[PDB]
RNA sequence: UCGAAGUAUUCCGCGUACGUU
RNA sequence: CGUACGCGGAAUACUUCGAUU
């Protein structure tokens, strides 16, 4: 009850809005770099503002009703790819997940949105091992498709 | 419209899983449904008594707005059985079916597949369908090419 | 991009009931 | 596996509103 409580998802939602550390444990190893409204609006320079070359991608990790979110900037380059692929890993997710799972199994989700295409991997807490190994390949592909 | 009963076309698309069909409703899938019966499913869970290994098949769906199609195909993780299930739908079969329920105003399109208690879903506006396909067809490949 | 409200869907988890039409 | 609801979430599409003078 304490775990999975609304008192913890609120902190997981607010965890996004910190520099390199928020009061609780997070699955991500990189900071959120979400753009301000103005920096996004000014993202109507020479193109449409959402379809072809966006400023980044949005990814989410959920363990039950405990959801973490991140916006990372992806310059469509191999160097920037290697940078965003390390936003999370098997150990970071399980470590975080161990802090909100146990007892009765719940629903876990990883979601990623890029170029108007959303990809979501969903399964039970006991399949978290298989979700991660699939979330990494799905993510790697979504970011290398043209 | 859709028309004129907007929900009746959704009603036929769900029945397409069972009938031919039937009908005349164009489907995005090229393979018939292979859903096991209740008994056949009760007994398949008795050889290697378990809950997610081995599975008799997988479940996949295509949604164009509220017009949803669904298939359950048998899959034994052999190369011969992988090439077939990969033929469940091609890029043209989905675009062909998509052209039948999509207009000018963009709607929500989805592809889903559940295998070994793992569900993968590809969602986006109907204007990115061509992109959902390339991303969905191979996302279907990796899900069926893994091990416990 | 952030937040909130609504509408139409999709998906996962848990629980209940009914099943070779 | 199929069907119907219940609960808790996630994702997408569309609409509206708000966002350092």
UniProtKB/Swiss-Prot annotation, chain A:
Keywords: Host-virus interaction, Inhibition of host innate immune response by virus, RNA-binding, Suppressor of RNA silencing, Viral immunoevasion. The keyword RNA-binding applies. GO terms for cellular component: virion component. Disulfide bonds: none annotated. The keyword RNA-binding applies. It comes from Carnation Italian ringspot virus. GO terms for biological process: symbiont-mediated suppression of host innate immune response. One of its GO terms (molecular function) is RNA binding. Residues 1-18 have a biased composition (Basic and acidic residues). This is RNA silencing suppressor p19. Belongs to the tombusvirus protein p19 family. Residues 1-25 are annotated as: Disordered. Homodimer. Acts as a suppressor of RNA-mediated gene silencing, also known as post-transcriptional gene silencing (PTGS), a mechanism of plant viral defense that limits the accumulation of viral RNAs. Binds to short interfering RNAs (siRNAs) with high affinity. Acts as a molecular caliper to specifically select siRNAs based on the length of the duplex region of the RNA. The chain holds residues 3 to 148 of 172 of the full protein.
């Amino acid at each position: 009850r304490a775990i999975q409580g609304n008192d913890t998802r609120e902190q997981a939602n607010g965890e996004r809005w910190d520099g390199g550390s928020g009061g609780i444990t997070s699955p991500f190893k990189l900071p959120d770099e979400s753009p301000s409204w103005t920096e996004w609006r000014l993202y109507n320079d020479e193109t449409n503002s959402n379809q072809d070359n966006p400023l980044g991608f949005k990814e989410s990790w959920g363990f039950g009703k405990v959801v973490f979110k991140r916006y990372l900037r992806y310059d469509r380059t191999e160097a920037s790819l290697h940078r965003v692929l390390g936003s999370w890993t098997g150990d970071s997710v399980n470590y975080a997940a161990s802090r909100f799972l146990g007892a009765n199994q719940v629903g876990c989700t990883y979601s990623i949105r890029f170029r108007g295409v959303s990809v979501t991997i969903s399964g039970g807490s006991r399949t978290l091992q298989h979700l991660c190994e699939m979330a990494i390949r799905s993510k790697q592909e979504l970011l290398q498709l043209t």
